[PDB]
Amino acid sequence: AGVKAYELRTKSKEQLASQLVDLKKELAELKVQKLSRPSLPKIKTVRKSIACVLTVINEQQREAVRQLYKGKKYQPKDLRAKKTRALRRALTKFEASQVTEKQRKKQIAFPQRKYAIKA
Amino acid sequence: AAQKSFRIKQKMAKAKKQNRPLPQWIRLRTNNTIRYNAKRRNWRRTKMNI
Amino acid sequence: KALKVRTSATFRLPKTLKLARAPKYASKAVPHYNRLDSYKVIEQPITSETAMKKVEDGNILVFQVSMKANKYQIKKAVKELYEVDVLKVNTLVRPNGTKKAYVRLTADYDALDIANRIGYI
Amino acid sequence: PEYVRVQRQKKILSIRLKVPPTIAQFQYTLDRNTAAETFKLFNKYRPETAAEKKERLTKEAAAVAEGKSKQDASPKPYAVKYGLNHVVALIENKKAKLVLIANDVDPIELVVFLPALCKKMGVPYAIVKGKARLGTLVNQKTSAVAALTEVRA
Amino acid sequence: GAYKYLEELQRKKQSDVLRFLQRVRVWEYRQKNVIHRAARPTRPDKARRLGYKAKQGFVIYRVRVRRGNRKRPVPKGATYGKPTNQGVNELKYQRSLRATAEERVGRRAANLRVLNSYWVNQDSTYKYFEVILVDPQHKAIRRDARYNWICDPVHKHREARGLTATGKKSRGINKGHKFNNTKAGRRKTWKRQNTLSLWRYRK
Amino acid sequence: AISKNLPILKNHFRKHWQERVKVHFDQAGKKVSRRNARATRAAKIAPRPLDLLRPVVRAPTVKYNRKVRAGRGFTLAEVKAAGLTAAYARTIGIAVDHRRQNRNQEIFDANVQRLKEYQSKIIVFPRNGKAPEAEQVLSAAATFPIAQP
RNA sequence: UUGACCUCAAAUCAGGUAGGAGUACCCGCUGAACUUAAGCAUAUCAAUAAGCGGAGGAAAAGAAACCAACCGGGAUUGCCUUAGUAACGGCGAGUGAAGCGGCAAAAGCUCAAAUUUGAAAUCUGGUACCUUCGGUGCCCGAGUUGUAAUUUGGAGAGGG
RNA sequence: GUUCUUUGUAAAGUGCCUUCGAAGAGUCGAGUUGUUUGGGAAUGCAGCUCUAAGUGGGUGGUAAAUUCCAUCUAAAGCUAA
C-alpha cells in the first residue's frame, strides 16, 4: 500500500507526528518477522512511507518559517536562492544598471538614432 | 594488534563483509558477464596493507 | 587633578562589556528532529542460538543497537519500548561492524515472557 | 602598550630635533584670555545644522511659488565659513576678514602654507589651539579652519 | 583650492620643512607593524588623484618592504650550471618593490581590492608605501557607478596579475617601438611569432 | 652537412615548434560563423547599414601616397562644415576622429561633399515610434564608394 | 568634575567577505640542463620545461607623452604580407622584429586639478511601511583633512 | 502594436563678443649594476645613487655640443566585438 503525499498534507502537525510513530512501531515488528522468514518484501512499503511523512513534515515547518520571514531582509541562508556561489556575489540588476548622473543626460540627449540609407 | 584503534577495526569489518562469493542468482540475470568475484582477498595469499 | 594610582608596573587589557548575540535570522530556521530516538537505538534483536539461550537462563536480552548509541541511550530506549526495568547494560562491537548490547533485566521481570510479546522465540 | 609609547615618544622626538621655521610658528597659539572673545564672536555666526535647515525649506516651499516671491523670503545668511578648500579660495579673492587655523592637524602640511598665504594676501590670521573646538562652532567633529567673510553692523 | 599648494610642496622633498617631517615619520612608521591600518592618508592630494575618495569603503594601509637586490636561494652559492648563471648577488627582481608592497597588502585584506599605491617615505633598510583599497561588497561601491567596475570579478587581485599602475609599468605595457617586445603581453607576443601558421591551401 | 651545391637555408625549427603548430582547419567553419554573426547582428541593429560611413583619406609613405583610402572618422572640423554636431553625427552613423586635422583642401572638400551626399540619402526616424520602415541596405561603403581623384 | 576630539583596542557585537578545487586556453613571478656549435666557456636549446601567485568565458590589451618625414596616417587585437628582411651573434653555430599596404572586427570614455558657499545640495546603516534584485518617511552615523553637481584638453568654464 | 502616467518656470544642443583656461614628483630624466631584447656608445625592466621643468616635457633607431622643425601630452582609471 503506502501513504500518499497529497493525503498527508491535509493533516495537522500533531496528526503527522502521531502517524510517524505508528509507522515506526510497524517497522519494528517487521524487522522481527524478517529474521524468521526467507523473504519480506513488505518492509520496503513501510520504510518508504516513513520517508513520505518526514518529507511532508519537513515541508510544513519550512513553509511556516518562510512566512514569518516573508517581506523582510535577512532571511535564513537555507531559505535563500543559492543558484551559484559566484552569481550570489555578482551585482544585482539595479546595481549593474546604475549609471552616473552625467552620462544619464548624454543618453537622453543623444540616443542611438534609427535610420536607413535609401533616400 | 589485540589493542587497536577504532579506525583500524572499521576497515577490518568492511574487508570481512566483502570476502564472500558471488550470489548464485546474479549469474542468471539478463546480459550478465560477471562470472566470479575478481576482488577476492585471503589473509594468506595477499596482505591488504591496513 | 592627579592621575590614577597604579600599584603594579604591568598594564593589561581592560575588561570591556561583552555583548550577547542577537541575530537577525536563524542559522537554519528548522531544528532537526532527534537524530537518535528510541526506535533508532534499538534496531533488531539478535536471535542466534547462543544468544537465545542467554534469554531464558541469564534473563538477558540481546539486541543489535546503533553504533552511535551509548549505554545511557540503550537503557532509556529499552525501558520505553518495552516498559521494563534494566539492571545493567553490556555492549560490544561485533567483527562485522555492528554494535551488540547485552541488556539484563531486574528480578521483577522475566526476559523469556517479554521476548514472546516482542515476537521471536 | 605600544600605542601609548609610540604617541608619547612622537611628541618627545618632535621637540629634541631642530624644528624648521615653517613649523614651530605653531604652538605660539592665541592665549587663553584672547581666545575667549574670539570664540564668543564666532559662536554668534554658527552655520545652520541639519535640524533648522528643514523648516527653512518648508517656509520657502510656501512663499516663493505661492506668494509670488523671488526666493528672497529668507534673509541673507551670516555664517562662519569652514573647509580647507573653501577658505583658501576666499583668502585669494580678498573675501576673508579673519581666519582661524588649528595647530594640531596631524597631516600638518595641509596648513603650513596658510600663515604664509594669509600674510602675503594681507588677511589677518590667528593660529588657534584645538581643531575639535573649531568643529563645534561648525557642527562637525573637526574643522581645523575657521573664516569670516562678512559681519553684521 | 588647497590641493595645488600641497602638490607643489610635496615636490620639495629635500627642503628643511619636508626633511624634518621625513625623519619624524620614518621613526613612527618603523615602530608599528610591517602591515598596519592607516586611519587617514598621509598625503591627501596624492591619494585623491589616484582614485581615493573620502567615504566609507575606501581603506588605506601602510606597508614597508626591505630594500636592495634579490639574492638567489642556491644554498651555499652553488647553482649547478653554466658559468653564465652563477650570479647570486646581483639579481634585480624584475617586479618593483612597490608591486611587492601591494601584493603583501592584498593577501592580508583578501576581502578588498587594491586600487593604487604611492611612495610616502624611505630609509636605508625599508621603503614605505601607502596602498589604496576599496571594498567591493560595500553598498557605496556596489552603487555609485563611477566605482562599481571593481566589483565585477575580473578585477580579483589586480596587483597579483600586474594590472595596477606599478604592475603595468613593470610589465612595460606602453605604446611605441621601444615596447615592441612588451605591448600586448610578453608571453602572448612571443607565442604569436613562434607559432607555425599552416592553412588548408598551403601558402 | 654541407655538400652538393644548394642555397644556404635558414629554417628556424630548433625549438619545440611542434607544440605551437596552428593548422586552420576551421577556415570553412569560421567563415560560416562570420556570415552567421553578420546575419544575426543586422537583425538586432534593424535597418542600419551594418557599418559606419568613413571618409576618403590619402595615405602617407610615397610608395602609397598616390592612393586614397577609407579612413576612420570625419575630422571634427569637417563635421561642423557639413552642418551638424559631432555628438549627433555618431548617432546617425558618421564615425568621428578627433585626433586628426585638415591640411589638404582637396581632401577636406571631398569629405565635406561625402557628408552632404550622406545626409541626402538617409531617412532619420523619429523617437516617437512611427516607423515608416526603409528595408535594409547591408553596406554603407557599397553605396558611397571611395573613388580615386 | 563633566562633555568632546584624535589615535589605538575589545566583543560568540549587526551584516558581509577571503581560503580550496579546476587550471586546455589567459595574466605575472621564478627558472634550468640535456642538446647545437662535430671539443667547449659567450651563444644556442630558452626569455622554454619544472616550481609559485592570480582570473575569466575569454583573459589580456585598448582610446596615443603612437606611427611617421608623407599630397601625412590615426584606440586595441587578429590574419595575409612586410620577412627569414633591417639588425643581433667566438659576426661562428644560429637568432630575428617593426612602420606602411589588404582584410576580419569596430565604440567610445572619466577621475585629480575650481567657491555650491544664498545654504553637504552626497552616502551607508537601523527602524516603520510599501508595488521588494528596490522605493518612501524618520532616526543615528560617514563626511568640510571634501561627499554631490559642473569640467577632462577633441576642450571647457566664468560672464555678457 | 496598444495602454497608463507629464516629468518641467527641469535638463540638453548650437551662434557672437569678452576674460580665463587649473591637466598627475623620489616621477620624468641621469649615472651605475644586473637581466633582457633584432635594438646595435646601452630595447624594456629592476636595485642603488642623484634628482627635474612649466610658452614645459617625452619621442623622432649612432654618442656629444649648438640651432631649428615635426609629432604627441607621461608619471591616474574604465570599456564590447
Side-chain angles (χ1 to χ4, degrees), chain A, chain B, chain C residues 2-121, chain D residues 1-67 72-153, chain E, chain F:
Chain A
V3 306
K4 310 282 172 31
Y6 67 90
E7 271 162 0
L8 290 181
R9 297 194 252 263
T10 47
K11 292 176 172 186
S12 45
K13 185 192 165 303
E14 293 83 3
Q15 284 187 256
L16 288 185
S18 183
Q19 183 173 351
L20 181 66
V21 174
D22 281 0
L23 285 170
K24 284 171 175 178
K25 291 183 183 292
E26 182 65 26
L27 182 54
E29 293 179 353
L30 267 68
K31 271 185 294 185
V32 175
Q33 309 155 25
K34 178 180 193 303
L35 57 85
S36 66
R37 294 179 66 188
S39 167
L40 197 48
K42 182 67 181 294
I43 191 167
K44 183 174 163 194
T45 302
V46 180
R47 284 193 326 231
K48 299 309 169 74
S49 296
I50 294 172
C52 185
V53 185
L54 284 172
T55 295
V56 175
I57 285 182
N58 183 244
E59 183 178 1
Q60 284 187 359
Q61 316 192 258
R62 278 179 85 87
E63 190 45 54
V65 64
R66 216 185 301 263
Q67 294 298 109
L68 61 83
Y69 279 102
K70 181 266 290 180
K72 62 167 55 177
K73 220 196 290 183
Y74 308 132
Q75 184 177 2
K77 273 179 172 178
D78 63 358
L79 298 188
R80 224 175 294 170
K82 181 177 174 67
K83 289 169 65 178
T84 300
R85 166 162 169 140
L87 289 177
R88 276 181 262 130
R89 316 278 146 86
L91 297 174
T92 73
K93 291 174 70 175
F94 172 81
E95 285 158 353
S97 69
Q98 280 285 83
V99 75
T100 185
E101 196 274 331
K102 167 180 181 176
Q103 296 294 321
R104 183 180 63 83
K105 290 182 195 146
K106 184 178 184 293
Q107 293 179 356
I108 290 178
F110 292 115
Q112 166 66 51
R113 299 304 304 271
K114 182 62 65 68
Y115 62 96
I117 53 169
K118 185 47 68 182
Chain B
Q3 262 166 346
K4 48 183 78 77
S5 54
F6 177 80
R7 214 193 272 290
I8 297 303
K9 188 175 174 191
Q10 211 176 15
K11 288 199 168 294
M12 293 177 70
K14 192 198 197 57
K16 180 208 182 190
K17 290 187 285 202
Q18 311 169 312
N19 213 17
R20 70 152 307 141
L22 268 179
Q24 282 319 299
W25 62 268
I26 278 175
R27 301 180 210 259
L28 263 52
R29 293 176 326 171
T30 302
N31 280 320
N32 192 2
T33 187
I34 305 168
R35 308 182 61 81
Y36 68 99
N37 193 355
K39 294 181 185 293
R40 199 80 194 269
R41 183 197 51 87
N42 191 255
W43 66 275
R44 180 63 78 82
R45 305 297 298 221
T46 184
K47 294 318 204 198
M48 65 182 179
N49 298 320
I50 297 169
Chain C
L3 282 72
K4 300 294 187 291
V5 59
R6 286 174 155 88
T7 61
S8 172
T10 302
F11 191 95
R12 185 176 177 87
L13 179 77
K15 294 181 176 67
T16 69
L17 193 146
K18 294 181 176 67
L19 216 55
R21 261 181 178 185
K24 297 199 172 308
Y25 58 92
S27 61
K28 48 165 59 180
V30 173
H32 193 294
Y33 52 81
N34 192 1
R35 272 83 169 182
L36 183 63
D37 52 352
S38 294
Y39 296 99
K40 280 215 184 310
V41 169
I42 312 295
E43 311 166 346
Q44 46 190 278
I46 286 181
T47 78
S48 66
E49 289 281 43
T50 187
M52 294 299 291
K53 74 156 91 64
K54 308 185 66 65
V55 166
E56 81 261 6
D57 296 348
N59 210 56
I60 287 164
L61 292 165
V62 184
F63 290 117
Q64 188 188 320
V65 296
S66 68
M67 288 270 303
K68 304 177 143 208
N70 53 41
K71 280 167 182 186
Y72 296 117
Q73 302 165 293
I74 292 158
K75 196 194 172 186
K76 193 189 191 161
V78 159
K79 65 179 73 174
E80 280 167 16
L81 289 188
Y82 314 114
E83 319 180 31
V84 294
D85 216 7
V86 190
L87 186 66
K88 209 195 177 190
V89 184
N90 285 36
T91 54
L92 64 94
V93 178
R94 297 195 283 177
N96 72 338
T98 43
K99 198 175 266 210
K100 179 209 283 195
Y102 287 114
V103 176
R104 188 185 173 178
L105 319 172
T106 58
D108 298 312
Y109 294 82
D110 183 275
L112 191 64
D113 296 0
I114 66 167
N116 294 334
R117 185 177 65 246
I118 287 173
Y120 77 110
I121 206 61
Chain D
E2 300 197 300
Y3 87 102
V4 171
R5 287 191 271 119
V6 76
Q7 65 182 177
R8 292 183 187 173
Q9 300 190 62
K10 182 175 73 175
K11 167 175 77 176
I12 283 178
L13 176 77
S14 178
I15 191 167
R16 275 90 164 106
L17 262 53
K18 286 176 68 176
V19 176
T22 298
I23 304 167
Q25 76 180 304
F26 304 85
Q27 63 84 30
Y28 292 165
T29 179
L30 201 52
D31 61 271
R32 152 164 301 285
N33 180 82
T34 305
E37 292 86 4
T38 311
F39 283 97
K40 175 193 121 173
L41 183 63
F42 267 72
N43 271 325
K44 297 164 195 170
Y45 297 95
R46 292 180 179 91
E48 55 173 342
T49 62
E52 67 271 16
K53 184 179 178 182
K54 290 195 289 222
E55 69 275 16
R56 201 274 302 297
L57 294 176
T58 62
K59 296 183 290 294
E60 287 288 31
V64 182
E66 289 76 9
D72 58 338
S74 60
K76 197 182 55 43
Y78 291 92
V80 172
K81 310 294 185 177
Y82 60 102
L84 184 62
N85 289 316
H86 183 36
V87 167
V88 161
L90 297 172
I91 289 162
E92 305 176 313
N93 296 115
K94 298 293 183 182
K95 288 202 178 191
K97 314 293 145 43
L98 176 54
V99 180
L100 302 187
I101 310 162
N103 72 312
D104 62 358
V105 171
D106 193 4
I108 176 70
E109 295 146 278
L110 285 160
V111 293
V112 298
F113 63 94
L114 273 186
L117 181 77
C118 288
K119 185 65 184 157
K120 183 175 174 66
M121 293 315 285
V123 60
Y125 74 98
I127 295 178
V128 68
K129 185 181 279 183
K131 73 170 167 278
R133 190 147 76 140
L134 291 186
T136 57
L137 61 86
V138 301
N139 307 289
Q140 316 272 341
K141 300 189 292 185
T142 52
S143 185
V145 173
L148 265 172
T149 56
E150 65 183 1
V151 56
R152 292 180 179 91
Chain E
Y3 294 113
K4 188 56 176 174
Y5 292 82
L6 280 75
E7 183 178 1
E8 189 52 43
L9 188 58
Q10 289 299 333
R11 307 179 163 190
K12 310 305 188 182
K13 288 197 187 61
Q14 268 170 117
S15 62
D16 308 330
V17 65
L18 272 80
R19 75 196 299 211
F20 162 81
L21 284 174
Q22 189 266 326
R23 277 177 74 221
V24 168
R25 280 178 192 146
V26 74
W27 168 86
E28 183 178 1
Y29 300 159
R30 198 160 46 233
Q31 308 309 314
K32 315 216 201 187
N33 277 0
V34 162
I35 295 171
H36 57 278
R37 169 81 182 267
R40 52 191 60 248
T42 302
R43 302 162 64 201
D45 72 295
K46 178 61 179 204
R48 84 177 292 105
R49 66 173 150 256
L50 282 183
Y52 164 85
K53 292 286 186 174
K55 50 189 203 171
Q56 304 168 326
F58 282 80
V59 189
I60 302 289
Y61 262 74
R62 201 167 299 126
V63 55
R64 80 199 189 222
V65 296
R66 297 219 157 214
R67 299 185 62 187
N69 301 342
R70 188 194 95 97
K71 200 200 186 191
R72 184 178 282 174
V74 290
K76 293 176 196 163
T79 315
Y80 314 108
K82 315 285 186 78
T84 185
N85 287 301
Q86 282 187 7
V88 175
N89 265 320
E90 275 163 306
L91 294 175
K92 293 304 192 296
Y93 186 41
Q94 296 296 338
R95 270 170 71 93
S96 179
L97 285 171
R98 186 152 81 91
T100 313
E102 287 185 357
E103 183 178 1
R104 288 204 215 277
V105 168
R107 291 198 303 268
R108 163 74 87 83
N111 69 313
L112 302 176
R113 301 290 152 81
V114 170
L115 195 66
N116 267 317
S117 47
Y118 50 95
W119 177 94
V120 298
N121 200 346
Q122 81 187 3
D123 56 62
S124 53
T125 318
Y126 291 114
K127 252 176 187 177
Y128 300 83
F129 302 94
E130 269 181 18
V131 193
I132 308 159
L133 282 78
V134 298
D135 193 5
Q137 294 90 28
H138 206 281
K139 295 304 177 178
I141 295 91
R142 289 186 91 76
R143 297 140 196 181
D144 189 358
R146 293 180 181 177
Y147 280 103
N148 60 354
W149 63 267
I150 193 66
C151 308
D152 165 78
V154 292
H155 304 109
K156 280 167 169 166
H157 293 276
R158 314 172 53 223
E159 87 285 344
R161 287 182 284 141
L163 294 177
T164 58
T166 177
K168 305 173 79 167
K169 174 74 176 66
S170 298
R171 291 158 69 207
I173 298 172
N174 284 265
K175 293 178 157 183
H177 65 286
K178 284 169 158 42
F179 311 90
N180 279 334
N181 272 314
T182 79
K183 80 174 67 162
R186 213 208 65 211
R187 266 164 268 262
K188 207 187 69 162
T189 302
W190 178 87
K191 199 162 138 81
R192 184 187 68 210
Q193 52 211 21
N194 283 261
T195 298
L196 182 74
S197 176
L198 297 180
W199 294 86
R200 301 152 69 220
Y201 299 95
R202 298 291 154 98
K203 318 204 67 162
Chain F
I2 320 178
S3 65
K4 285 198 313 270
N5 189 359
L6 275 154
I8 288 147
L9 309 161
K10 297 172 81 167
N11 290 304
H12 295 47
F13 296 101
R14 277 156 172 265
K15 325 188 194 178
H16 299 287
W17 63 276
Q18 301 197 119
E19 291 167 352
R20 302 174 295 274
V21 174
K22 183 46 194 293
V23 194
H24 298 266
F25 297 118
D26 48 347
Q27 183 188 32
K30 281 205 299 185
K31 175 172 178 174
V32 171
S33 294
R34 301 187 210 105
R35 305 191 77 239
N36 282 348
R38 282 193 291 268
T40 187
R41 197 202 176 215
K44 183 175 174 66
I45 59 166
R48 312 217 315 259
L50 201 75
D51 71 280
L52 313 180
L53 177 77
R54 293 182 184 271
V56 71
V57 167
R58 205 153 267 273
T61 315
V62 302
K63 179 174 178 188
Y64 293 111
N65 68 349
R66 69 206 210 269
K67 301 294 230 315
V68 285
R69 160 174 70 76
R72 187 179 173 85
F74 279 92
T75 301
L76 295 167
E78 291 167 358
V79 180
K80 185 177 180 180
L84 77 165
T85 43
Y88 177 73
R90 280 197 177 100
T91 73
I92 317 301
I94 299 164
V96 184
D97 190 11
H98 66 86
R99 72 179 67 87
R100 76 181 276 253
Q101 321 292 134
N102 281 135
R103 65 179 64 88
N104 192 344
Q105 196 72 53
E106 297 91 299
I107 289 279
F108 174 84
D109 291 331
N111 281 333
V112 168
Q113 184 57 39
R114 200 169 160 86
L115 278 191
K116 296 281 186 60
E117 294 293 328
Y118 184 74
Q119 295 165 256
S120 62
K121 288 279 274 295
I122 52 172
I123 301 299
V124 183
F125 293 117
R127 318 184 179 194
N128 301 137
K130 301 288 98 175
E133 306 198 272
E135 61 86 20
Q136 196 169 21
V137 171
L138 277 296
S139 183
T143 306
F144 318 93
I146 300 284
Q148 317 293 307

